[PDB]
Design an enzyme around this catalytic site. Structure first.
Site, PDB file in Angstrom:
ATOM      1  N   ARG A  38      -8.423   1.025 -20.754  1.00 28.66           N
ATOM      2  CA  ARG A  38      -6.827   0.811 -20.410  1.00 28.66           C
ATOM      3  C   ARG A  38      -6.804   1.590 -19.263  1.00 28.66           C
ATOM      4  O   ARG A  38      -7.087   2.899 -18.938  1.00 28.66           O
ATOM      5  CB  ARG A  38      -6.588   0.630 -21.446  1.00 28.66           C
ATOM      6  CG  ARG A  38      -6.562   0.064 -23.070  1.00 28.66           C
ATOM      7  CD  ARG A  38      -5.884   0.875 -24.208  1.00 28.66           C
ATOM      8  NE  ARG A  38      -5.880   2.070 -24.236  1.00 28.66           N
ATOM      9  CZ  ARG A  38      -5.313   3.039 -25.809  1.00 28.66           C
ATOM     10  NH1 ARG A  38      -4.763   1.975 -26.222  1.00 28.66           N
ATOM     11  NH2 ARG A  38      -5.865   3.975 -25.997  1.00 28.66           N
ATOM     12  N   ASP A  40       2.990  -0.158 -27.032  1.00 29.60           N
ATOM     13  CA  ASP A  40       2.480   0.554 -26.323  1.00 29.60           C
ATOM     14  C   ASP A  40       1.326   0.380 -25.066  1.00 29.60           C
ATOM     15  O   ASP A  40       1.040   0.937 -24.263  1.00 29.60           O
ATOM     16  CB  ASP A  40       2.030   2.219 -26.419  1.00 29.60           C
ATOM     17  CG  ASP A  40       1.679   1.972 -27.329  1.00 29.60           C
ATOM     18  OD1 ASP A  40       1.146   3.357 -28.061  1.00 29.60           O
ATOM     19  OD2 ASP A  40       0.468   1.579 -27.458  1.00 29.60           O
ATOM     20  N   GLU A  72       1.612   1.746 -34.976  1.00 26.42           N
ATOM     21  CA  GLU A  72       1.029   0.846 -35.021  1.00 26.42           C
ATOM     22  C   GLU A  72       1.110  -0.459 -36.291  1.00 26.42           C
ATOM     23  O   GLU A  72       2.832  -0.046 -36.793  1.00 26.42           O
ATOM     24  CB  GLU A  72      -0.718   0.889 -35.877  1.00 26.42           C
ATOM     25  CG  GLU A  72      -1.625   1.997 -35.560  1.00 26.42           C
ATOM     26  CD  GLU A  72      -2.359   1.131 -34.108  1.00 26.42           C
ATOM     27  OE1 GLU A  72      -2.651   0.341 -34.424  1.00 26.42           O
ATOM     28  OE2 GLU A  72      -2.277   2.057 -32.803  1.00 26.42           O
ATOM     29  N   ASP A  93       3.402   7.274 -27.591  1.00 28.86           N
ATOM     30  CA  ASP A  93       2.637   6.900 -29.241  1.00 28.86           C
ATOM     31  C   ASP A  93       3.614   6.006 -29.756  1.00 28.86           C
ATOM     32  O   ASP A  93       4.703   6.511 -30.097  1.00 28.86           O
ATOM     33  CB  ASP A  93       2.589   8.152 -29.948  1.00 28.86           C
ATOM     34  CG  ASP A  93       1.042   7.483 -30.788  1.00 28.86           C
ATOM     35  OD1 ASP A  93       0.520   6.048 -30.326  1.00 28.86           O
ATOM     36  OD2 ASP A  93       0.529   7.665 -31.626  1.00 28.86           O
ATOM     37  N   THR A  94       3.249   5.020 -29.749  1.00 39.49           N
ATOM     38  CA  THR A  94       4.699   3.897 -30.781  1.00 39.49           C
ATOM     39  C   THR A  94       3.200   3.589 -31.743  1.00 39.49           C
ATOM     40  O   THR A  94       2.230   3.498 -32.182  1.00 39.49           O
ATOM     41  CB  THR A  94       4.378   2.518 -30.150  1.00 39.49           C
ATOM     42  OG1 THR A  94       2.821   1.740 -29.598  1.00 39.49           O
ATOM     43  CG2 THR A  94       5.656   2.581 -28.980  1.00 39.49           C
ATOM     44  N   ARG A 133      -2.564   0.380 -20.799  1.00 44.77           N
ATOM     45  CA  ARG A 133      -1.968   1.487 -22.023  1.00 44.77           C
ATOM     46  C   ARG A 133      -0.485   2.584 -21.650  1.00 44.77           C
ATOM     47  O   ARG A 133      -1.253   2.546 -20.129  1.00 44.77           O
ATOM     48  CB  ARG A 133      -2.565   2.735 -23.093  1.00 44.77           C
ATOM     49  CG  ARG A 133      -2.237   4.251 -23.612  1.00 44.77           C
ATOM     50  CD  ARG A 133      -2.012   3.270 -25.146  1.00 44.77           C
ATOM     51  NE  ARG A 133      -2.192   3.857 -26.257  1.00 44.77           N
ATOM     52  CZ  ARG A 133      -0.538   5.181 -26.051  1.00 44.77           C
ATOM     53  NH1 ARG A 133       0.197   5.108 -24.995  1.00 44.77           N
ATOM     54  NH2 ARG A 133      -0.496   5.416 -26.432  1.00 44.77           N
TER      55      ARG A 133
HETATM   56  C1  LIG Z   1      -1.873   7.371 -23.335  1.00 41.50           C
HETATM   57  C2  LIG Z   1      -3.478   8.041 -23.817  1.00 41.50           C
HETATM   58  C3  LIG Z   1      -3.967   7.758 -24.186  1.00 41.50           C
HETATM   59  N1  LIG Z   1      -5.597   8.244 -24.338  1.00 41.50           N
HETATM   60  C4  LIG Z   1      -6.197   7.609 -25.689  1.00 41.50           C
HETATM   61  C5  LIG Z   1      -6.620   9.160 -26.808  1.00 41.50           C
HETATM   62  C6  LIG Z   1      -6.579   8.622 -28.444  1.00 41.50           C
HETATM   63  O1  LIG Z   1      -8.595   8.353 -28.278  1.00 41.50           O
HETATM   64  P1  LIG Z   1      -8.266   7.976 -29.687  1.00 41.50           P
HETATM   65  O2  LIG Z   1      -8.781   6.654 -29.964  1.00 41.50           O
HETATM   66  O3  LIG Z   1     -10.175   8.667 -29.499  1.00 41.50           O
HETATM   67  O4  LIG Z   1      -7.363   9.117 -30.587  1.00 41.50           O
HETATM   68  C7  LIG Z   1      -5.945   6.744 -27.565  1.00 41.50           C
HETATM   69  C8  LIG Z   1      -4.938   6.851 -27.722  1.00 41.50           C
HETATM   70  O5  LIG Z   1      -4.454   5.637 -28.052  1.00 41.50           O
HETATM   71  P2  LIG Z   1      -3.448   4.442 -28.881  1.00 41.50           P
HETATM   72  O6  LIG Z   1      -2.216   5.363 -29.118  1.00 41.50           O
HETATM   73  O7  LIG Z   1      -3.522   3.197 -28.479  1.00 41.50           O
HETATM   74  O8  LIG Z   1      -4.185   4.621 -30.361  1.00 41.50           O
HETATM   75  O9  LIG Z   1      -6.093   6.841 -25.810  1.00 41.50           O
HETATM   76  C9  LIG Z   1      -5.926   8.945 -23.176  1.00 41.50           C
HETATM   77  O10 LIG Z   1      -7.061   9.120 -23.447  1.00 41.50           O
HETATM   78  N2  LIG Z   1      -5.524   8.649 -22.286  1.00 41.50           N
HETATM   79  C10 LIG Z   1      -4.137   8.887 -22.371  1.00 41.50           C
HETATM   80  O11 LIG Z   1      -3.025   9.049 -21.413  1.00 41.50           O
HETATM   81 CA   LIG Z   2      -0.435   3.884 -30.568  1.00 48.22          CA
END
Ligand SMILES: Cc1cn([C@H]2C[C@H](OP(=O)(O)O)[C@@H](COP(=O)(O)O)O2)c(=O)[nH]c1=O
Ligand SMILES: [Ca+2]
Length: 130
Positions: free
Chosen positions: A76, A16, A38, A35-36, A30
């Site tokens: 991102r 993702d 890891e 959510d894919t 992103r």
């Molecule tokens: C998809 C997305 C993720 N995020 C943040 C939430 C998560 O924060 P925390 O790391 O603090 O949980 C993280 C999840 O990303 P990843 O799934 O790449 O880890 O990215 C946003 O703030 N907005 C979004 O639209």
């Molecule tokens: Ca992910």
């Protein structure tokens, strides 16, 4: 209303997250509403390979920001990505390689489209849902 904008692929990171050249600047993007896993988790390598193939083989890559915030706390870009008109966000969910997640009001224009795709992947017991 939403609109698609051109972007050039720099490098696919994982399922993702991808690095794109947007408006002449290298950025990490992103995918919205998904959510894919890891790379180190179940179906992580599968999701990474799926996205990598889809973006690398594409002739045209476009990004579509939603109506809300365009970047997350990590810097991102947050958008719907399209590879030759096909939404990567939806493709991953339809394939059971990603779950609908991080649904925040304001940036949820395609929520129903994605949930429909998830329901079908679940019904078909695909990958994550197997
Ligand atoms: C998809 C997305 C993720 N995020 C943040 C939430 C998560 O924060 P925390 O790391 O603090 O949980 C993280 C999840 O990303 P990843 O799934 O790449 O880890 O990215 C946003 O703030 N907005 C979004 O639209
Ligand atoms: Ca992910």
């Amino acid at each position: 209303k939403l609109h698609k904008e051109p972007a050039t692929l720099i490098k696919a990171i994982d399922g993702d997250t991808v690095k794109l050249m947007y408006k002449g600047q290298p950025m990490t993007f992103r995918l919205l509403l998904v959510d894919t896993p890891e790379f180190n988790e179940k179906y992580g390598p599968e999701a990474s390979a799926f996205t990598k193939k889809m973006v690398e083989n594409a002739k045209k890559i476009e990004v579509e920001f939603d109506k809300g915030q365009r970047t997350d706390k990590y810097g991102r870009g947050l958008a719907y990505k399209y590879a030759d008109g096909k939404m990567v966000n939806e493709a991953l969910v339809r394939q059971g390689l990603a779950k609908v997640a991080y649904v925040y009001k304001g940036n949820n224009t395609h929520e129903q489209l994605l949930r429909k795709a998830e329901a079908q992947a679940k019904k078909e017991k695909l990958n994550i849902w197997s």
